[PDB]
Amino acid sequence: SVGIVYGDQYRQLCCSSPKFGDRYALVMDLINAYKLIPELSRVPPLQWDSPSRMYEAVTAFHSTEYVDALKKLQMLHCEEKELTADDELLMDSFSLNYDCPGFPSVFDYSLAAVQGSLAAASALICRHCEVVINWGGGWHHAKRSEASGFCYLNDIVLAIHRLVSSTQTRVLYVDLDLHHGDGVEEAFWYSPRVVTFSVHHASPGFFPGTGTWNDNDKLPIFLNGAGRGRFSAFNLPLEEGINDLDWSNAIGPILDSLNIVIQPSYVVVQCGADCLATDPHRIFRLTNFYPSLSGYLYAIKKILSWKVPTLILGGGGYNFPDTARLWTRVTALTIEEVKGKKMTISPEIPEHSYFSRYGPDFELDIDYFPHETLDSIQKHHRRILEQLRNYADLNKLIYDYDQVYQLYNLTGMGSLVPR
């Protein structure tokens, strides 16, 4: 069973923010227009039996004072009067400003993603679904008491906490967004049982600034967790311009090696679409092509081949029609891999009420033409495999050198694997 989170009120709330507009509606209606919905189990967003129960769920990660302020922010925007000087100071102390402003539905909107991702986690735990998709979740930047990067509540952290607390259990978090998954990495910085791995662009002044090299008389180093969590936070920063094949070859062996050594009970994937070549960021050059294979589809197919219960989340993606094109192909691929059932998608966009948003071509492939020794990252592979070996030793896990070696030897790079 492949699950997908949706509902009537859920759709309205996910489409109520000023930044993401109707993106969620385009995504779900394109999935529906390609007749995928009858193949999927609807997973209803979680609801609670009291305000105290909802508050207890959200403050499993976020501070009480931060949740109080976010609810007040919504109350204030639902009325006419402006904020007092002391209300402004309170909101500024939680970064509820700039890129994370208030709007009349800001609390309900943020809470909805939490409701959907917690429901998704519960459907994996009780083995009702082998995979669950939530295209309304994936907000990786929010911190315990701080909004960041259009993210107000961290549905990912709360979903992972539910998985890891169910009954040895380890979770592997994989972050494919253009940006570093800083909020999820920070929440589990001291926790060996949640291993985080983000691949992303990093460069001076590019948001959020972390996930890359860190005094004046020593070579830079990668921080990678602390305390009991030492060696448990992984990062691969990449330069701008990377294409499908080079991104696939960059993360593929690393993903396979993480699965071999960590042996996770659950995988959580953030699948932000802002690495597409047609995203207005224009930083990476990934596609949604499916023969010349989309880096995204290569990575998802590899993750699903492990047969580990998996949560697939959304995230960034600022070309709304092209984000829908990618996530529709991810959804079809998940059905095929899990159910063994061929899913044939017409190259022409089907009739539906958002059809006119797919112009001028009205085709499923994004409108991009890919075009092309010293840009390699073999020293990153070596650094990351040494970190994985250190993680295994610290946590008294089997490090199967022979299997990791043969994996890397498939591409002639077995010498990078440490013993």
**234 and 198 Cβ atoms separated by less than 8 Å:** yes
**376 and 384 Cβ atoms separated by less than 8 Å:** no
Residue nearest to Zn ion (CB): 316
Choice between 99 and 393, CB closer to ligand GM5: 99
The reply to whether 233 sits near a copy of itself by the rule CB under 8 A is no
274 annotated as belonging to a binding site for a ligand: yes
Q: Which of residues 67-106 bind ligand GM5 (CB under 6 A)?
A: 99
**Among 22-30, 89-97, 298-306, 314-322, the segment contacting ligand GM5 (CB under 6 A):** 314-322
177 annotated as belonging to a binding site for a ligand: yes
What is the DSSP annotation of 103-145?
A: -TTHHHHHHHHHHHHHHHHHHHHTTS-SEEEETT---TT-BTT
Token output for 147: 């909004």
Choice between 183 and 253, CB closer to ligand GM5: 183
The phi and psi torsions of 269 (rounded to 5 degrees) equal: -115, 125
User: Considering CB under 6 A, how many residues would be counted as binding ligand GM5?
Assistant: 15
Buried b (16+ CB within 10 A) or exposed e, 122-139: bbbbeeebbbbbbbbbbb
Residues with Cβ < 8 Å from 97, sequence gap 6 or more? Answer: 91
* Sole binder of ligand GM5 in the list 45, 225, 309, 316 (CB under 6 A): 316
* Sole binder of ligand GM5 in the list 62, 179, 381, 383 (CB under 6 A): 179
Annotated active-site residue in 141, 180, 201, 281:
141
**262 and 196 Cβ atoms separated by less than 8 Å:** no
User: Considering CB under 8 A, how many residues would be counted as binding a copy of itself?
Assistant: 73
Q: CB under 5 to 8 A by kind: which of Zn ion, ligand GM5, K ion, none does 188 bind?
A: K ion
What is the DSSP annotation of 221-235?
A: ------GGGTT-EEE
The reply to whether 315 sits near ligand GM5 by the rule CB under 6 A is yes
Distances (CA, A) of 275 to 197, 266, 328: 16, 25, 16
Tell how far CA 7 is from the center of its chain. Answer: 21
The reply to whether 340 sits near a copy of itself by the rule CB under 8 A is no
Instruction: Print the binding letters for residues 246-275 with Zn ion: x by CB under 5 A, - otherwise.
Output: --------------------------x-x-
**Among 2-10, 83-91, 313-321, 334-342, the segment contacting ligand GM5 (CB under 6 A):** 313-321
Strands (E), 32-121: 41-43
Task: List, edge to edge, every strand of the sheet that includes 171-175.
Answer: 41-43, 2-5, 131-134, 310-313, 266-270, 171-175, 194-201, 233-238
Q: Which of residues 23-62 bind a copy of itself (CB under 8 A)?
A: 38-42, 44, 46-52, 54
Distance in angstroms (rounded) separating the CA atoms of residues 168 and 334: 27
Tokens 């227009």 belong to which residue? 33
Choice between 355 and 368, CB closer to a copy of itself: 368
**Among 133-141, 158-166, 259-267, 365-373, the segment contacting a copy of itself (CB under 8 A):** 365-373
Neighbours of 212 (CB within 10 A): 19
The reply to whether 179 sits near Zn ion by the rule CB under 5 A is yes
77 is annotated as an active-site residue: no
* Sole binder of ligand GM5 in the list 296, 318, 358, 408 (CB under 6 A): 318
Residue numbers belonging to the annotated binding site: 177, 179, 274
Residue ranges binding Zn ion (CB under 5 A): 177-179, 272, 274, 316
Residue numbers belonging to the annotated binding site for Zn(2+): 177, 179, 274
Residue ranges binding ligand GM5 (CB under 6 A): 49, 99, 141, 149-150, 177, 179, 207, 272, 274, 280-281, 315-316, 318
> Which residues are marked as active site?
141
